[PDB]
């Protein structure tokens, strides 16, 4: 009921995976021009949801 939010997926990423590749990084990556480091202020996302 509260939601099984213990399971996660990649919402935002910079590159496509190769077959059977796993990537478990929690680093914030930029979407646009702003460095946006350690924040989700503008033009970036924390990649997992």
């Amino acid at each position: 009921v509260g939601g099984n939010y213990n399971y996660l997926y990649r919402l935002f990423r910079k590159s496509n995976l190769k077959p059977f590749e796993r990537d478990i990084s929690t680093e914030i990556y930029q979407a646009g021009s702003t460095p946006c480091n350690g924040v989700e202020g503008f033009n970036c996302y924390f990649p997992l949801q």
Binding site: G32, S33, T34, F42, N43
Partner: protein, 42 residues
């Protein structure tokens, strides 16, 4: 000067060039979200 709420002004634009990458990326913007499209296209 902006159209007011309940006095909107939706301008039709065609047969031209626009840079949506700049429109999206500039630091002057407070927020941005797309629906089936991406600003990186132009």
């Amino acid at each position: 000067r902006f159209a007011s709420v309940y006095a909107w002004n939706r301008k039709r634009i065609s047969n031209c060039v626009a840079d949506y990458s700049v429109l999206y990326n500039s630091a002057s913007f407070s927020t941005f979200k797309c629906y089936g499209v991406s600003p990186t296209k132009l």
